Design an enzyme around this catalytic site. Structure first.
Site, PDB file in Angstrom:
ATOM      1  N   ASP A 104       8.651   9.261   6.265  1.00 25.95           N
ATOM      2  CA  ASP A 104       8.462   8.426   5.086  1.00 25.95           C
ATOM      3  C   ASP A 104       7.626   7.195   5.414  1.00 25.95           C
ATOM      4  O   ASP A 104       8.157   6.210   5.937  1.00 25.95           O
ATOM      5  CB  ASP A 104       9.827   8.001   4.548  1.00 25.95           C
ATOM      6  CG  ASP A 104       9.725   7.153   3.299  1.00 25.95           C
ATOM      7  OD1 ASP A 104       8.616   7.087   2.715  1.00 25.95           O
ATOM      8  OD2 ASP A 104      10.759   6.549   2.905  1.00 25.95           O
TER       9      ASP A 104
ATOM     10  N   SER B 135      -7.818   1.633  -3.746  1.00 24.65           N
ATOM     11  CA  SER B 135      -8.733   2.695  -4.137  1.00 24.65           C
ATOM     12  C   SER B 135      -9.843   2.114  -4.998  1.00 24.65           C
ATOM     13  O   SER B 135      -9.642   1.140  -5.713  1.00 24.65           O
ATOM     14  CB  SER B 135      -7.959   3.785  -4.884  1.00 24.65           C
ATOM     15  OG  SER B 135      -8.803   4.750  -5.496  1.00 24.65           O
TER      16      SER B 135
END
Length: 330
Positions: free
Chosen positions: A35, A199
């Site tokens: 994770d 992004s």
């Protein structure tokens, strides 16, 4: 040193991925959910409340000659999906794919929430976010990666998750055969303890690319792709009959649909998520309403590039003094 381990979807939907991890002496192998959005290595154990164990493999520290109670240490964690666990702590030898850390904090669960109990395939979590998020008190502990880092050939790990197929976590090296083209690296902020990056935009299907900054986290422990409501609405508007259902808890779409791809930007590069990756199947057995793999982050407080996005790429988690993230197509 290096390590290399195969990671395997837990079910036919890629709801999560499990990776075998050796703990203790002699080894006890547990299948852990790696994770990159948390920083605790915790396991089902011989200390876990019996009624909360249902098929998981447990760690029994009393059977490990290298286990030592970390006296006074406790831990307690709550995840974004509302699940939680807590307990006490041992140090022990932990190996992943041939890479060994001695003195790793292994957090033994005394209690786990129902979501964990009900998932027989996940024996615990191995956190790979920054150690500043580790919950052990009163002495915070380091992640497996942080502990291994100085010994690694290069201070990196990579995630290469499969679509409906196994993939690989590598530590200490970049497998240049595992991706196509080049890796594009992008800046990381560690201020919130995550692999947080920005992004450069998105496209829906064959549509034009929209240049827009989307701050979010690379999180292998989250199934879906969670993005701003504007972006998510633009995606589902291209699927006839798709709608947001408050009763179901997100966007659903007719199972008869063909889903468009979704592209996200990494610098000047582009990662394409095929439409099929965005199908999470019937909302309930036999339903013709299917659950979408792109959902709104509104009210999460952060955008999350979960498995839906990451499995479309070869992803480098670069833990150099100034961390960065790399993405390549594959």
């Amino acid at each position: 040193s290096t390590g290399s381990a195969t990671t395997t979807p837990i079910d036919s939907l890629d709801d999560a991925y499990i990776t075998p991890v050796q703990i203790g002496t002699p080894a006890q192998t547990l299948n852990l959910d790696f994770d990159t959005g948390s920083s605790d290595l915790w396991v089902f154990s011989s200390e876990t409340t019996a009624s909360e164990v249902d098929g998981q493999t447990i760690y029994t520290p009393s059977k490990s000659t290298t286990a030592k109670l970390l006296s006074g240490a406790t831990w307690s964690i709550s995840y974004g999906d509302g699940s939680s666990s807590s307990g006490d702590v041992y140090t022990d030898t932990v190996s992943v794919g041939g890479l060994t850390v001695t003195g790793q904090a292994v957090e033994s669960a005394k209690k786990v929430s129902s979501s964990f109990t009900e998932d027989s395939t996940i024996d615990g979590l191995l956190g790979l976010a920054f150690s500043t998020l580790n919950t052990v008190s009163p002495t915070q502990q380091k992640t497996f990666f942080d502990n291994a880092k100085a010994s690694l050939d290069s201070p990196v790990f990579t995630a290469d998750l499969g679509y409906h197929a196994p993939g690989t976590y590598n530590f200490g090296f970049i497998d240049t055969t595992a991706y196509t083209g080049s890796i594009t690296y992008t800046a990381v902020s560690t201020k919130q303890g995550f692999w947080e990056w920005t992004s450069t935009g998105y496209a829906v299907g064959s549509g034009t690319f929209k240049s827009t900054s989307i701050d979010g986290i690379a999180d292998t422990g989250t199934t879906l792709l969670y993005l701003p409501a504007t972006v998510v609405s633009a995606y589902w508007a291209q699927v006839s009959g798709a709608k947001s259902s408050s009763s179901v808890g997100g966007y659903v779409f007719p199972c008869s649909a063909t889903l468009p791809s979704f592209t996200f930007g990494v610098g000047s590069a582009r990662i394409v998520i095929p439409g099929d990756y965005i199908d999470f199947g019937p909302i309930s057995t036999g339903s013709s309403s299917c659950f979408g793999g792109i959902q709104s982050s509104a009210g999460i407080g952060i955008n999350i590039f979960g498995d839906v996005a990451l499995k479309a790429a070869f992803v480098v988690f670069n833990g150099a003094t100034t961390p960065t993230l790399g993405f390549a197509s594959k």
